[PDB]
Amino acid sequence: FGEDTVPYERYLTPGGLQMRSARVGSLREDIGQRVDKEVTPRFVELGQVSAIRTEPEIAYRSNQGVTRQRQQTKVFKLVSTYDKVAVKNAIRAAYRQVF
Amino acid sequence: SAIRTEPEIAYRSNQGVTRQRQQTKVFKLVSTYDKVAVKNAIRAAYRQVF
Amino acid sequence: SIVTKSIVNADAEARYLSPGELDRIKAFVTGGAARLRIAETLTGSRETIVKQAGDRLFQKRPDIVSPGGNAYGEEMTATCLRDMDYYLRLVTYGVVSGDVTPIEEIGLVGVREMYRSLGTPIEAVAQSVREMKEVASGLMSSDDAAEASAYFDFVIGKMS
Amino acid sequence: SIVTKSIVNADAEARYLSPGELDRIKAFVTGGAARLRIAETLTGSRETIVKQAGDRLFQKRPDIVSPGGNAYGEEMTATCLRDMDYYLRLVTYGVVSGDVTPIEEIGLVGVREMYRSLGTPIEAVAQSVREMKEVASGLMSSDDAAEASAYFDFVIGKMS
Amino acid sequence: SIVTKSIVNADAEARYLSPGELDRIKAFVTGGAARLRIAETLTGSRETIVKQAGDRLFQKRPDIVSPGGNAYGEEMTATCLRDMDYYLRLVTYGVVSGDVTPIEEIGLVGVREMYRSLGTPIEAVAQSVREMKEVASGLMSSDDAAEASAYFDFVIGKMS
Amino acid sequence: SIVTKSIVNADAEARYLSPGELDRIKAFVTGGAARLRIAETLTGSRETIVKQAGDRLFQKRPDIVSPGGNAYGEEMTATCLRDMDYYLRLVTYGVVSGDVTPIEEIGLVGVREMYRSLGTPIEAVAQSVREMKEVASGLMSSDDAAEASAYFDFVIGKMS
Amino acid sequence: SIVTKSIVNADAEARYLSPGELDRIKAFVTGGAARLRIAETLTGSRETIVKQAGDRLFQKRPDIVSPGGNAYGEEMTATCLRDMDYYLRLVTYGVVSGDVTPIEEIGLVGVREMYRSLGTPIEAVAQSVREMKEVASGLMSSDDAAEASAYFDFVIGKMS
Amino acid sequence: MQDAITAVINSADVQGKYLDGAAMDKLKSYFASGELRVRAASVISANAATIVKEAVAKSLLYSDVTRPGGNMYTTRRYAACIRDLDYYLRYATYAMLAGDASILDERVLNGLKETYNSLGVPISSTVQAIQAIKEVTASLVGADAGKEMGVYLDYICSGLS
Amino acid sequence: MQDAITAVINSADVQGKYLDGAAMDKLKSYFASGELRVRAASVISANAATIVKEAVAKSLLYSDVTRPGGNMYTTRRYAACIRDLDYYLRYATYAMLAGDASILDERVLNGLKETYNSLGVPISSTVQAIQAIKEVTASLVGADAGKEMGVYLDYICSGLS
Amino acid sequence: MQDAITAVINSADVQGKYLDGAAMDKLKSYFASGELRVRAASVISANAATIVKEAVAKSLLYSDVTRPGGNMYTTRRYAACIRDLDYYLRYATYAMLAGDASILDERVLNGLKETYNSLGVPISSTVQAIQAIKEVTASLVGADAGKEMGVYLDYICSGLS
C-alpha cells in the first residue's frame, strides 16, 4: 500500500480459507471430488431423431407408406345365420362393396 | 466404382441438358458485304421463325 | 384406440355408433386418467427401465453381448438398448391408447422378418421385453403393474 | 471434333458440307495417326506425369499442402492428384480429337465456380496444369510437345 | 457476471446496491435474451469457427505447425484446436455473464506462464483467438458481432 | 443511387413512383446524414487505411512484391497503392450513394480483363480490398463498419 | 405487401434482399401498430365515412344520380355505395400491408375495362374516392391522414 | 441516368478526387430538399392526368392547332399529342425527383427535336403546352416545388426549342 | 406470391369483410416475428455461399454423384448444383422472410420435379443436401430462428419428394 | 468534476431556483450533442493506442529527445511518455463526454506542471506531442467532434504551459 491505498486482506490462513470455501454452499463441484462428465446414453443418441421435424414433416410422415385404410376396415364373415342382425349387416356391407 | 455396363454408359453419356445447347449455331449479320453470309442468315431466320 | 376401432366398425356398417359403443367410449375416457398416470410413470422411469432390463437380459443371455454375438460391441449393445427403448415407448403408447393397436402397428408387424434379416435372436428380444416388464412391475403399483403387464405380455407373445 | 463442328455448321446452314470442309476433315483424318501416337504417349506415362507434376506444384506452392491448406492431408493430396489425373485425361481426349472441345465441355465450364465452392486456388490449379504440361513436353518429342502444349495452354488460359 | 460484480462492490462499501447499480442489473436482465442468442450462435457454430480459425492461423503462422514447431503433428494440432475450442467456450461464458470475469478466472490468469512453460507462442495463441473472433463476427450481424468483439478483444489484449 | 434505381424501375413500368418507393426515398434521404458521416470518416482516414491495408497485403502475399511479381519495385508498389486508393474512393462513392452502381460503373466492369492484361493477380486485388475492409472496420464505429461492409464485400465478390 | 414487393424486386435482380430493404421491412414491422390502428379506425368509421363521401359525391356530381346517368335509382346508388365500400376496404388492405400491390391486384388493373363495360364514369369514380379520402382525413389525425392519403391518392391517380 | 448524388459523384470522379466540402454541401442540400421533392412527386403522380387535361384545355383546345389543318387535328394526332404531354410531365417529375436533368437529356431530348421537325409538329405549340403544364403543376404543388418543376420543364422547353 | 400479411388480407377478401380482431392479432404476431425473420434473413444472405459449401461437403462430396459418370461430375454440372443449391437457399430465405411458403410453390416447385426427372437429378440426394442446408442454417441462426428456415426447407423437400 | 448537466444544476442551485427555461435549453443542447460525443468517445476508445502511435511518430520520434541524452531516450522513459499521452487522450475523451474541462483541471493538471518541472520533462515537446494527438484525433473522428476534442487538448496544453 502506498501513501494512498487502504489496506485489505491479502492472505488467508488455510483454516480460514477452508471455513470460507468448504461449506455446503460455496463449495465447488470439482474441489475434492471425482467429477464424472455426464453424457447422454448411447442408445438414446442412436434412437434420437435428427433435425427438428417441423409440423409439415410430422404430418407428412404420419401418413407415409401404405394408407392406414388397409388395417382400418372390417371383414364380414357370415359365421352363423342364426344372428339375423349380423346377417342383415353382412348383406348391407355386400351391397356397399358390390355397388 | 462398379463395372459401368453399356446401359449405364449410354444413359450417362447424355445426363443433363442436351448437347444441342452447344451444338448449334448463332447467326450474326456482322457485315452486309458478304452476300452468301447474308443469304445464310436469312435462310436461318426463316428456319427459326417458321 | 377403442374410439378409432368403434368408428371403423360403425363406418363399415354405415351407421352411427350404438349406445353400447358410446358407453365403452365413456368408460375408456374415465379410465384415461389412470392410463395417463401409468404412461407418465413409465416415461419418467424410461432410462431406468432400459438400463436394468438390458443388464438382466445380458445376465440371462451373455452370448448376445459376447464376441461373435449380435450385440457384442458397445455400439451393438447401445443398439439393443435403442430397440428396448423403442419397445418401451410403444408400450407406453399402447397404455395411453388402452389397446395394443399402436404397438402392433408400429413394431410388431414383420418384427420376426426384420430380426431374422438382422440376425437377431427373436427369443432374446422376447426375454428383453420380459425383463422390461419385470422392472416396470417392480417400480410400479400392483394394479398398474397388471395393466402394463397386459401390453408387455402382448408384445412378448407377438415376439414368440 | 472438327467432324461434329462441321456437321453442326452444315446443319445450321441447312446444307451439305462444302469442299473446304470435306478437305479439312480429310486432313484431320490424315493427322489422326500422329494424334493417336501423342495420346498413347500421354496415356502411357499417366502415373509418372501426375507424380512429378504434383511434386513440382507442391514445391512451387508449399502452402496448399501445409497444414490449413486445401491439400494438407494425405487424402487432400490424393484428391489433388486425382484432379490432375482428370485434367490430363481430358487433355488426352483433346489431343485425340484435334480440338479442345472435350476439355472445355467436361472440365472447363464453371471450373472457376467449382473451385471457388471447394476453396481451391484456381491459380494453383493452373500452375499444376502447367507442371503437367512441362512434364509431358519433357517426355515427348518437340513437335508433339507443341501439339500437346496447345491444349495444355488452352486449359491453363481457361483456368487463369 | 454484472450482478456478481455489483454485489461484490456493494459488499465492499458495506451498503445496499445503489439505484444506479440496480438499474444496470435490471437492464442486463432485460437484455439477456440477446446474450443468450449470441451464446447459442457460438455454441452451434463452434466446430466451424474453430476449424476455419485454425486453418487461417496455420496459414498466417506456418512455423508453429511445420516440423520443429509447437503444434506440429496431428495430435499437437488436435490439442491446438482443443485450446481454441476452450477459448471459444470461455468467450460464450463471458457473453452469457455479461462480464469478462469468467474468462479471466478460467483462461486468462497465468496464461502467459502456462504457454511459456508449454513452449507455445503466446502471440500465436492470440492470433488464433483473433482469427476465431473474425470468423464469429462474420457469422453474425453487426450488433451481436460488436457485442462478442468486446470479449474477443479482451482475451486478445490479455494474451498480447 | 436508390433514387436512380426507383426512377429506372418506374420508367420501365411506364408509371409514376409508388408510395412505397417514395417512402424508401424518404428513408434514404434521412439516412444521408449517416452516409455522409461514414464517407467523411473514410475520406479522412483513407491514407492510413491504404497504407496499413497495403502492408498487410504485402505480408500476406510476398510474391506480388517479390521479384518477378507485378508489384515488384517501388514504382509498381506505388501504383498498386494508387489502385487501392482508387477502390477506397469508389467505396466512398458507393457509401454516399447508398448503392453499388458507382463502384460497378467506374471500377468493376471489365476489371478482370484489365488486370489480366496488366498481369495482376485478381485474387491479390481482392485480398487488398479485404484488408482495407478490416482496417476501415477497425477504425470505424460498429454500425458504420456494418454499412461499409456491404460495399467492401460487393467489391471483394466482384474481384473474386 | 411491402415484404412481398421487396421480395419480388430481389427475385427479379436474382439476389438476396439488400440491407436497405431489410431495414425497410424492420421499420414497417416495428411501426405496424400505427397501421393497425389506422385500419381499425377506418373499419370502425366505415359506415359514416362511406355515407358522407357518397352523399358529397352526389351533390358534387349529380349527373351520375340524374336520369340517364349511371346510378339514377336507389338501387344504382346502392351499387355505388358497394363500390365505394370496396375501395375503402382495398385502401385499408393497402394500409395494413404497407404497399399498394394488394390494391392494384384487387381493383386497379382492368378497372378501366370494367367501368367501360358497365358504362360508369371512371372520372366520377375517382371523384368518389377523393371524397372518401377527404372524409377520412377529417376523421383521422394529420399524420395518419397523410399515411392513408398516400394510398387514396394512389388509387385516385390510377383511376384517373 | 443521373441524379444529384450521381452528378456530384461523377464531377468528383472525373477529377479522381474524394468528395470535398463542396460536394458534401451539395449532397446535404439535396438530402434536405428530398422531402419536398418526394411530396411534390406524390402529388403530381396523384393528379397527373388532370394536370395534362387542364394544360391542354388552357393552351391548345379551341385553337388553330385543334382546328382542322392544325397538327392536333384527328383523334390519332390528338392522342399522340396527349401522350407526348403525359410523357413530358412524367419525365419532368422523374427529373425533379432525381435533382438533375440528365434523365431528360437522354430520355426526352436526344432525337425529339429532329423528330418533331420531320413530322412537322409545332415546336412553339408544344412549348406553350409545356408552359401551361408548368403553371398548372405550380398551382398544384405550391411555389417551392413548383419552382423546381418549372425549372425542369423550362429545361425541356429550351432543349426542344 | 403471398406472405403472412397477404395471407391475412386474402383470407379477409375471400369473404369480402374488413379486418376484424383476429386478423389484426395475426398481423401483430407476424410483426413480432419480423425482427427474428429479418435477423435470420440477413445472416443467411451474408453466409449463403458458406452454407451451401458445408452442405455439399457433408452431404455430397466424395460420392457416386461426384465420381466420373456421376450426375455431379463434369464441372459445369457441379457449378449447376452450386447454383441450384443457392437458388434453394435464397428462395427458402424468401419464404422465411414472407412467413408463407407460396413463393416456393409458384417460383421454385413449379416444374422443378419435372425438371429433375427429365434431367436425371437425384431427388433424394438433393433432399439430403437441403437437409444439410437446414442443419447448417439452424446452427448458424439458432434454434428458434432456425426453426422457420427448417420449416421452409422441409416444405421444399416435401414438395420435391 | 462537473459535466454540462452538473454545471447547469450548480448554476441553478447558487441562486436557489428551480430549473428555468435557460437550464431547460442548455440540458436539451447537451442531450443533442450527446450522440456525437458518445460516438467520438467510442471511436477513440476503440483506436486509443493507435492514435498515440501516429502521434508519437509524427511528433517525437527521430528527435534529440528520443536519441540518447534526451528525456525519452530510456526505454522506461519512452514507456512513461506513451503512458502520459494515453492519459491525455483518455482524459480529453472524459472531458468530451462530460462537456466540461473540470475533470481536466482537477485531475490532469492538479500538479502536472510542478511534477514535470521537478522531473525535467520537456514541456515544449510534450505540448507538441499533445498537439499532434489533437490533429490525429481530429482526422480520425472528423471535424465536428475533432473541434471540441482539440479544444480540450488545447486547454490541457495551455494549462501545462
Ligand SMILES: *[C@@H](C)[C@H]1/C(=C/c2[nH]c(/C=C3N=C(/C=C4\NC(=O)C(CC)=C4C)C(C)=C\3CCC(=O)O)c(CCC(=O)O)c2C)NC(=O)[C@@H]1C
Ligand atoms: C439386444 C437387445 C438384441 C438385439 C438388438 C439389435 N437391434 C439392432 C438393429 C436394429 N434394430 C432395429 C429395430 C427396429 N426399427 C424400428 O423401426 C422398430 C420399431 C418400429 C424396431 C424394433 C433396426 C431397424 C435395426 C437396424 C437399423 C438401425 O439400427 O437403425 C442391432 C444391431 C444389428 C447390426 O448388426 O447392425 C442389435 C444388436 N440383437 C440381439 O442379438 C439381441 C436379441
Ligand SMILES: *[C@@H](C)[C@H]1/C(=C/c2[nH]c(/C=C3N=C(/C=C4\NC(=O)C(CC)=C4C)C(C)=C\3CCC(=O)O)c(CCC(=O)O)c2C)NC(=O)[C@@H]1C
Ligand atoms: C491440388 C492439386 C489443388 C486442390 C485440389 C482439390 N480438389 C478437391 C476436391 C474436388 N475436386 C473436384 C474436381 C473435379 N470434379 C470433376 O468432375 C472435374 C472434371 C475433371 C473436376 C476438376 C471435385 C468435384 C472435388 C470435390 C468432390 C470429390 O472430391 O469427390 C480437393 C479436396 C477439397 C475438400 O475439401 O475435400 C482438393 C485439395 N486444392 C488445392 O488447394 C490445390 C490447388
Ligand SMILES: *[C@H](C)[C@H]1/C(=C/c2[nH]c(/C=C3N=C(/C=C4\NC(=O)C(CC)=C4C)C(C)=C\3CCC(=O)O)c(CCC(=O)O)c2C)NC(=O)[C@@H]1C
Ligand atoms: C426399401 C429398402 C425402400 C422402401 C420400400 C418400401 N416399399 C413398400 C411397399 C411396397 N413396395 C412395393 C413394390 C413392388 N411390388 C411389386 O410387385 C414390385 C415388383 C418387384 C415392386 C417394385 C409395393 C407394391 C408396395 C405396396 C404394397 C405392399 O407393401 O404390400 C414399403 C412399405 C409400405 C407400407 O406402408 O407398408 C416400403 C418401406 N422404402 C424405403 O424407405 C426404402 C428406400
Ligand SMILES: *[C@H](C)[C@H]1/C(=C/c2[nH]c(/C=C3N=C(/C=C4\NC(=O)C(CC)=C4C)C(C)=C\3CCC(=O)O)c(CCC(=O)O)c2C)NC(=O)[C@@H]1C
Ligand atoms: C446438384 C446438387 C444436383 C443436381 C442439379 C443440377 N441441376 C442442373 C440443371 C438445372 N437445374 C435447374 C433448376 C432450376 N431452375 C429454376 O428456375 C429453378 C427455381 C429455383 C430450379 C430449381 C434447371 C432449370 C437446370 C437446367 C439448366 C441449367 O443446367 O442451368 C444440373 C446440370 C444440368 C446440365 O446439363 O448442365 C445439375 C447437375 N444434379 C445432381 O446430380 C445433384 C443431386
Ligand SMILES: *[C@H](C)[C@H]1/C(=C/c2[nH]c(/C=C3N=C(/C=C4\NC(=O)C(CC)=C4C)C(C)=C\3CCC(=O)O)c(CCC(=O)O)c2C)NC(=O)[C@@H]1C
Ligand atoms: C402535343 C403537345 C403536340 C403534338 C404532338 C405530336 N407528336 C407526334 C409524333 C411524335 N412525338 C413523339 C415524341 C417523343 N419522342 C420521344 O423520344 C419523347 C420523349 C418522351 C417524346 C415526347 C414521337 C416519338 C413521335 C412519332 C412517333 C409516334 O407519334 O408514335 C405527332 C404526330 C404528327 C403527325 O403528323 O403524325 C403529334 C401530333 N402536336 C401538336 O400540335 C402539339 C404541339
